Design a protein around this nucleic acid. Sequence first.
RNA 1: AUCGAGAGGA
DNA 2: CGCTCTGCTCCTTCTCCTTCCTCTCGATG
DNA 3: GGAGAAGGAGCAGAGCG
Lengths: 262, 112, 539, 97, 36, 81, 171, 142
Amino acid sequence: RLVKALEDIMVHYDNTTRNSLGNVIQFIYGEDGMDAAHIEKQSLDTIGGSDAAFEKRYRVDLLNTDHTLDPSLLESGSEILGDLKLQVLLDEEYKQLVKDRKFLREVFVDGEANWPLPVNIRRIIQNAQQTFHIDHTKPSDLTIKDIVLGVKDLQENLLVLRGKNEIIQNAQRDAVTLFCCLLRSRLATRRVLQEYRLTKQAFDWVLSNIEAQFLRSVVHPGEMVGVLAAQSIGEPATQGVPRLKEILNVAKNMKTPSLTVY
Amino acid sequence: AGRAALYKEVYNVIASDGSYVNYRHMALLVDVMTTQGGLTSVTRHGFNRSNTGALMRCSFEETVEILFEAGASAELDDCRGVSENVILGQMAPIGTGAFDVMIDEESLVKYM
Amino acid sequence: SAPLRTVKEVQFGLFSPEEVRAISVAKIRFPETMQTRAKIGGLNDPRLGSIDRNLKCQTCQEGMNECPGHFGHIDLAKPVFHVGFIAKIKKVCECVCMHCGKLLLDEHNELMRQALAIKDSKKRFAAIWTLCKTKMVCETDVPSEDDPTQLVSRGGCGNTQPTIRKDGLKLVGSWKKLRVLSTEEILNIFKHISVKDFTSLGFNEVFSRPEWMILTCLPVPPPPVRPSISFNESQRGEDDLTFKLADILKANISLETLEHNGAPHHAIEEAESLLQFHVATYMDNDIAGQPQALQKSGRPVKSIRARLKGKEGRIRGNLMGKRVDFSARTVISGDPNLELDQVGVPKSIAKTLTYPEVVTPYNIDRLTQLVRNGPNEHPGAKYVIRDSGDRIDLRYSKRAGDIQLQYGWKVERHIMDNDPVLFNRQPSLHKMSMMAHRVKVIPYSTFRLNLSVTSPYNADFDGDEMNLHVPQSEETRAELSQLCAVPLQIVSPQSNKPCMGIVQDTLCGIRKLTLRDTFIELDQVLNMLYWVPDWDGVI
Amino acid sequence: LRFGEMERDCMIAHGAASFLKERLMEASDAFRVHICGICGLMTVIAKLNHNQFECKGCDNKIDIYQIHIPYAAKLLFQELMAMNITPRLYTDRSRDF
Amino acid sequence: ENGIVDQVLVTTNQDGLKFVKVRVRTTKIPQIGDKF
Amino acid sequence: PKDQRATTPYMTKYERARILGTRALQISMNAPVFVDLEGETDPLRIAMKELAEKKIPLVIRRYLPDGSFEDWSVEELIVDL
Amino acid sequence: MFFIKDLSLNITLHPSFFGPRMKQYLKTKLLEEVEGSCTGKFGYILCVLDYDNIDIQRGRILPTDGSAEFNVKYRAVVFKPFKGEVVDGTVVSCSQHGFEVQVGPMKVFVTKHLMPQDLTFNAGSNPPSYQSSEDVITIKSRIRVKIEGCISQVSSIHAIGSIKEDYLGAI
Amino acid sequence: QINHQGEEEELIALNLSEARLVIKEALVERRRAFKRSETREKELESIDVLLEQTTGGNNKDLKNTMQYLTNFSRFRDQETVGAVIQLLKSTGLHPFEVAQLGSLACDTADEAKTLIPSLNNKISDDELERILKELSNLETLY
RNA sequence: AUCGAGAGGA
DNA sequence: CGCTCTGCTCCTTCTCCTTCCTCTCGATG
DNA sequence: GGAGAAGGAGCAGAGCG
Ligand SMILES: [Mg+2]
Ligand SMILES: [Zn+2]
Ligand SMILES: [Zn+2]
Ligand SMILES: [Zn+2]
């Protein structure tokens, strides 16, 4: 019964989900345009932890002593310390991260910090570390300017849609909202410089890899999502269950109506 | 509001047994039952009573009754559905059949 | 011959009674079929689908192979209700002014203008019916909404209308001042309805006219729809449809005979119902009422509706799913020494399933050798197809050692190594249970699978059976390999997890093998390295 | 062996449309018919031996097309005609754009 | 089938109609795939 | 509407399937071959070789919901599968 | 009468014909089929206007097999008769019950039943023309005819001519 | 009417004499298509030569057709054909009616009315009178 | 051959 | 305030509804 | 036998006379 309901739903080349009549069911497949085969659970560090811990893990201050960048991390030491221009960039990054932290608090009320998102950033970075055995005991050659701008540049290339008009562009930004928040969490200036002491060549390799990985992960047009979704619910339904029958059939007269009052 | 509440109900039923299915799969189903501006069931009185191709509808649970209505109203099927092309024995507009391939004579000359 | 096209859209409608007569190639008149082998011209004659060895089929020849049937014509003595539309007739007549042809209500009532504004024809018809059905009078002068003091002289009849009731296969109307409605009367009423009312009622001028909902002539399906039956020792036992039609003709002839000879009015009334009964049951042998047409053997007659309706009918049983060739079914069993995407196909099967390979300059030599081997050996072929369609059978010819292949000829090559084949474990609960493997031929009668592939199939080696499907066109081979090949479903969208993995002994073995305590003597190691096909020769 | 409903559902999910058609047509039920352009009924008298064609009731001899459909489907339309339903099949979509 | 004829019986019912029954036997050896 | 094509420049796995099958069918029917032969007799395999060298002279007409379309040359499409 | 109209014909090419030289070959196949053709809708198809600028319109590979379809459009010159039309034709052959005359690319049978009542067959003439009246009509002579309805056929097209009129006489 | 290029072109009631001129032009283009690989007697042979060097001599029926149409062509000189085109078309005459008059002989308005029933009723005789002798003089010039 | 009924699996 | 009219509410009817395969057996025209 | 569609029947209030 379920399959016949969803038999004619497919993703067209404009990345929209329509039935046989052309009626639009979902403007973007699955609200993210991302295939289920190329998505996996990942952590969202910016959600959990105390505010002090969050600030410690992300905030960088080149002017004060609270969050001074250790000069031994990079070939450039004091040259970075005291540079207001670079401080402005760090403020913009931290500003954005603060917005994401409070933003995600609304998306996930329960505070859970693990959800399926495409492109395993953590795995890619480790592959970078072992790629050419980067020596994590010596200063790197990265610059805050390269780090900050590189992250922004990548976000631009996370193209799921192609329409140049504002309406499509607005959806494009909303398509990669959550995923971009993850990217900023694990590519922050402090973490990349301290936790993952990559070289400039290695860092550029990672960025170039993420976009390539992400594009491959976008759902493919012509997918017969309808039946695929129908079966994926039917299969586990063979293992509650009468309730499912009580749901798919509207059956106003339920078995155990109840309320939950807070 | 009902749609989101419907999703939450379906998710609990599936998750109660310890199994796990991706969010998008439920999202599509819960969405389909509400695109019609109301809780349209998936029974004989719900999805079946749609405005889709008659030739598609007739195969679900009522066949001869539906055919009579289609003839009376002179309904027309666009053959864009999957089951419709299955009956007619043609390539359905899905997967490899959702587009067309053509030969470029210009490139053919160039490839010489 | 004629241009080749493809169906683009399907338009439904009702036969126009004149059109039926135009289409038919012969008028059916006699319920009789035979004498000994000659056939009555007035029933299932050679002008319809001819029986085998009779190349007439309305001068179409080609036997039953390349020629379909053709429809006949029966002139009913009286009009009869179409079973499928009896309810619709009730609604329509409740809406028309009953011997005026106009609608009980008009555009001068605001309620319809909302209804007439509905784009959906079905809802439009339903909305109108809900209103007009309560309008029991069609007075001529209707006060205008804009000018209450002014009335519109629309209603031609100006009289009242009766409450139409469904009585078995006929309609009864209770006049508010009670009699059975005449079938011919309704036809007259429908013929007086303007095309403007057709649209408001949801009818199409050139495809569905209300009068066409009442049958005046029957299309007679040709033999291929109701095949000639010779199951027993040349006994007829013709299909139910054939016998059912004969009953209609008997009823029709009697009704015509009674009316013509003496006009025994009361007898005509019964004969009218009998014809109504036989035609109704013929089209549908399951009505709300008791009447159940029974065959001479006592079993209910299999009307047209029964053939289509329900599973195993003409939709679910033959169109959606159908029996197929180039397939096999047998018992499975595990085999560690086989890769994932591979399978063992018994020689006894590969020697039967065939693939139509096309002879080309790149493979003429190999194909030539296969034909030389012949169907007796495994690596051979069964048939050599000439360009003209000469399907040579190597099974019954010594020409296997004489035929010289020509470019463009097809060879029914046996299944050989690496030929993709699609599997299935009934039931096909979900996508993963249908995947494409590669063929390696083995000498025993079972299907060999790699152990780890049973997890998606949900299969088990306790005697479970499993089907095999062979593609035929080169296009399908590529389509299966690049979309349904085993390794392409390692990661399943079911749960975002690798559907397949190491299971059973292999999984148990690994734990011990990787245990910190396990050490391997040199002699054993040298064997292990060689087993790994990807070893690089470096100890 | 029956390629039942669930068997075709799997093919749809895999998106292998061409294979599904091949299974439903080349394996079995392959059948060539002729149709009238004026009316979508398989009433064409295909005098193949003479390369002559006609649709009595339309007096047409130029609007003839060949269509490949399952033999089982061909019965369905005929039985629908026997039901007094006219499954008119057209090879040209009415909607242009 | 593949075997040898064990015993051929010829008889008649109460109606005098001649009947023939043939019992054919063969040896089945445990093969690959047989259930136990 | 070649200007401003709004579809993906990447070849969806489905066109990869049909193109390989389609071109393979053409090769089996003795169609002219663009690439040199390395003893490769399996018509599908040549198609994969041809697709690697972008020697397939086919163009994809992708359809949109409204019935319009865009044309992509096999050369233009990016093969990342 | 002669007309200019844009004709479309669908050609199918076998894959072996997919070499670069196909374009010229496709044009070659078009000309043989279209040139000198008959049909009840447009009558006789004579030639193609604008031999070049042929709208090949890309080859649609048919999913069934490797052959591809070609929707070729082109202007064409065609002849279409009309009931009551007047043609200044000529006699092709003589006969006792009428004459075979030339009308455009079309043959018209001018029956004696539609000729002046005073005009009679004279078997003694060579060719066997009518001369009993002033309307002397032989093969070598000219004849203007009136088309009394067209009778089209599958292999060819012809019509019925008349001479018993104040116009459409001999020569 | 509408052509396959989406242009609402009216029915081209092309005249008999101008047809051969177009056929001439078209046939020369075919010969040019091969190359890169007036009195009625002169035109008859001219078109005869054109067909033989542009075709294989198979459709002789068409060769006889074009020869006989030339034998009865009336406005052969294309430069002067433009005059008859303007004379008839400038009056708003229905193009089908234009075809017959420019393709059939006529001297008087009554004669034009007599041959063409569509002209017997609504045509302005004065314009035919002026045009027809103008065309009759034009016809004699050939 | 079909239908109907039954037994047994997957 | 009774008459009337109308929609609302109540109260009975009245249909029409559920993977794959392999064997045997009796009974019909 | 269940569940939903359907059709009648009774009733009560709002406007009318
Ligand atoms: Mg099992
Ligand atoms: Zn026939
Ligand atoms: Zn009336
Ligand atoms: Zn027709």
